[PDB]
Write a protein that binds this ligand. Structure first.
Ligand SMILES: Cc1c2[nH]c(c1CCC(=O)O)Cc1[nH]c(c(CCC(=O)O)c1C)Cc1[nH]c(c(CCC(=O)O)c1C)Cc1[nH]c(c(C)c1CCC(=O)O)C2
Ligand SMILES: Cc1c2[nH]c(c1CCC(=O)O)Cc1[nH]c(c(CCC(=O)O)c1C)Cc1[nH]c(c(CCC(=O)O)c1C)Cc1[nH]c(c(C)c1CCC(=O)O)C2
Lengths: 356, 356
């Protein structure tokens, strides 16, 4: 692979001093880009995901608009449940759906052995390699996957729940079957994530998007052990393969209650949602993890001038060390690309001013 | 009105020592009760709300099953937007809907003057009086309303949003119109809440159910001032009317980031969701507010034996002083009444053991 030109993102991830704060945005390849919609109009969603060229193109799109300090591959977290044997449909203007969720412990029987999952996701590896080659060292490439608990919620729920009541019913009523499912997911995720790095990913983000539906006690029993195992096992397998381990990012959305635990879970970076004050997060995690985030994505509905002032405040709170700027969640589909541009320019402008 | 027999709930609310921990459950009059469904089958939802006898009956139902230490009137937070002139429909198996949300600043013109709202909600006052008379002093009666921000989200959104992106777009793009709407809501809520107490309510809970979609900065600008004003103004009007002010409870769901602010907002009690560790909440709020909550409602899917152990742990964390037990949110419609029974008995059994 081509030699990396801008490695600011990796340097911040590992906790090193940099000349400016690196920035990227969750869902930077997304519907808010007119060119994304155009490209996506040509295949259905999961067919797009299975085309290395389409995936590479969508990844590159935001970089052509903004001097983002990292690319993130175009794919989806739900490819893992699908590779485990579940049917997932993209419902027009309504999102992902599993028409046949796991309903009882006996349904675990229709899942693939987790060890065969990486070979089912070869198309994602092809997209990563192609994208790493085409980026030609411009910025690092982030690969990613959903965390076990979050993936479980998609596998068990019949869609669009603000409570995850069915998924949580599993934890309380079927704890053994839940642990079994969470282990299956962990054992699929580890070789998949290793494969992403083998294929060229230079950093990994694990999305625990549904962390907030859990309190501390359930999170520590059912989410945290597997989060920990994913990091331990991936790092170990990369070492054994003779490869360099990549910085790993854990993002537990609405996971304020878990920050201390997450800072000791084997991840270089803890991503934060926008509800956590940067200073309080820094107290929780201490001084040896990098924090990523955390601007309210809706702040990008404000004027470019206002975005700049909000970014300035945010950077003041985080301070210059051990920090990668991002939003507190993904970009929304009605957002203005010029305002995303303003967010990028503002992190770069103010982070320099905060140093020199 | 009949003299109050069991005032444990009020004594804990004001912060006084009690012989046991008082307990009630949000949505204790709800679908999880077969008798509730039966009664509700006779009218449509908002027609039920407009019948003092139906409201009284639903309120009493849980008390006939469980020795709960408080009743809460049957009504809904959405009666306020409706009394302001918005049409709200109850969508079969899908919940409340505003077919015509406020879309722009100009839509504020179709709202009633907030001063006339209390007189539109006379039916709720009738339900409260009837219920206070029928309860005959058994336990205190809680009245309630939605907080301004939360009510705004219902008025502006086109339903079922996990982001409140439109409501938040208002805050960033239309801050002046947002403040105008939030003031209208505050000015409707104050005379309404005062009226509830005049009619017989012995405590008030304000539901900031959508607090979590905001971070600290937006919450402090747009939610907190009005929360503060509601308490200041209600207390003042009750004093002036020659009445005793009632304990007030603020419940900001997913409002971990606001606890310190909320403890100095003029409320006797801060209600907590289940994601906040009781000990951390106690550090945030200090020693002069009462905490209410906070058991994961899904914990009631566990066995009666498990519920007891979870309750015991919870009570250990909160300690005996300045505490009212409740769930961290409302009861879900698929929950077993016997397990709600188990939750009640367990708070009573263990809180005594924790004292004597
Ligand atoms: C709508 C949706 C999809 N996939 C998913 C949803 C949300 C479903 C729900 O609310 O429960 C599920 C999903 N996909 C992803 C996550 C984790 C991140 C998160 O919490 O948002 C989750 C929870 C990562 C992703 N999913 C995707 C990426 C791509 C990285 C990038 O494109 O920049 C990631 C990290 C790509 C994707 N995937 C999808 C779209 C529309 C896109 C493009 C981005 C957009 O316009 O929203 C379909
Ligand atoms: C489904 C629904 C209703 N009303 C509402 C919803 C949720 C809509 C959404 O998710 O956005 C809106 C609502 N109603 C209430 C709140 C605040 C409390 C909360 O966050 O849940 C909110 C956010 C108080 C209430 N709403 C109600 C009470 C009654 C107090 C009690 O019944 O014990 C309260 C405090 C009564 C009510 N109101 C409704 C039902 C079905 C019931 C019975 C309880 C149940 O089975 O869920 C309709």
């Amino acid at each position: 692979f081509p030699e990396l030109k801008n490695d600011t993102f990796l340097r911040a991830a590992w906790g090193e001093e940099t000349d400016y704060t690196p920035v990227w945005c969750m869902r930077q390849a997304g519907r808010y880009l007119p060119e994304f919609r155009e490209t996506r109009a040509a295949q259905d969603f999961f067919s797009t995901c299975r085309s290395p060229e389409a995936c590479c193109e969508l990844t590159l799109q935001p970089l052509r608009r903004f001097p983002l300090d990292a690319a993130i591959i175009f794919s989806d977290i739900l490819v893992v449940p699908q590779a485990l044997g579940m049917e997932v449909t993209m419902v027009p203007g309504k999102g992902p759906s599993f028409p046949e969720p796991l309903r009882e412990e006996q349904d675990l029987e229709r899942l693939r052995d987790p060890e065969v999952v990486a070979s089912e996701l070869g198309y994602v590896f092809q997209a990563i390699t192609l994208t790493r080659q085409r980026l030609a060292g411009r910025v690092p490439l982030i690969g990613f996957a959903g965390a076990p608990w979050t993936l479980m919620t998609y596998m068990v729920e019949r869609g669009g729940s603000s409570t995850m009541a069915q998924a949580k019913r599993w934890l309380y009523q079927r704890p053994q079957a839940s642990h079994q499912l969470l282990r299956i997911l962990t054992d699929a995720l580890v070789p998949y994530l290793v494969g992403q790095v083998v294929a060229g990913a230079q950093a990994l983000q694990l999305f625990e998007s549904h962390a907030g539906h859990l309190g501390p006690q359930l999170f520590n029993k059912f989410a945290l052990p597997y989060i920990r195992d994913v990091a331990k096992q991936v790092k170990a397998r990369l070492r054994e393969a003779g490869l360099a381990p990549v910085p790993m990012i854990i993002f537990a959305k609405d996971g304020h209650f878990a920050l201390e635990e997450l800072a000791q879970a084997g991840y270089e970076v803890v991503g934060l949602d926008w509800t956590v004050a940067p200073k309080k997060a820094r107290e929780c995690v201490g001084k040896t993890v990098t924090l990523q985030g955390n601007l309210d994505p809706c702040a990008l509905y404000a004027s470019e001038e206002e975005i700049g002032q909000l970014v300035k405040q945010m950077l003041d709170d985080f301070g210059p060390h051990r920090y990668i700027a991002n939003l507190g969640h993904g970009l929304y589909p009605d957002m203005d690309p010029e305002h995303v541009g303003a967010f990028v320019d503002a992190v770069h402008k103010h982070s320099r001013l905060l140093r020199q």
